[PDB]
Design a protein around this nucleic acid. Structure first.
Lengths: 101, 103
DNA sequence: GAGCTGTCATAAAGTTGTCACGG
DNA sequence: CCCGTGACAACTTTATGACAGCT
């Protein structure tokens, strides 16, 4: 597990930190986990049901639209460096994380 | 307690003298807060759990209670205010504490 | 001319899963 | 499966101010 860097956005597990350039971005633990999954599997879409599975649990109960709300917070928080652009929606399929846009 | 001095954002720990100075002003603080700071500064930009701090600073998690670390982190903070360096003792909710220069 | 420590109980702060509404 | 937001009530994790015993 190393520091993940893309488009000037970094996530270091060790320090447990998210930084847009030299600017650190505050955000709850769920979001950190969310981004941590996206950043580990970029250029791949996931339906909400797959996010709750990969991020919450194969046996978790949370409702599909819960995902949206977290994508949203992960976006409001990825704003300072304009990186919310990387948190991409895919109509009728789910969400994607990508360096392309 | 190694050899050379630790220099960061104007904050410094000199093992040799066993002293902490913000710029040039000395900073007072008990033996532990100093040991903690000595650990934090040699292991920066890396989050540690209260438990690990016990093992590393206290040398063992057996006699003290996890939350005792919060108290010390606080006292270290009050001791780093003068030069404004209390900013480097950062709380990583649900994970512990971390020492960092990037804020 | 004291300076330190480890725990508590308590007040604070930051999170979370859903909703209702709108776009 | 349409998705994105701002608002919530409850819940969980931290920061403090004391406190009494010791070194």
């Amino acid at each position: 597990e190393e520091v993940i860097e893309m488009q000037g956005l970094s996530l270091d597990p060790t320090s447990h930190r998210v930084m847009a350039g030299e600017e650190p971005l505050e955000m709850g633990p769920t979001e950190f986990k969310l981004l941590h999954f996206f950043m580990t599997h970029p250029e791949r879409v996931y339906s909400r049901e797959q996010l709750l599975n990969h991020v919450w649990g194969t046996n978790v109960y949370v409702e599909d639209r819960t995902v949206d709300v977290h994508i949203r917070r992960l976006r409001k928080a990825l704003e300072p460096g304009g990186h919310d652009r990387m948190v991409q929606t895919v109509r009728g399929t789910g969400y994607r994380f990508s360096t392309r846009f």
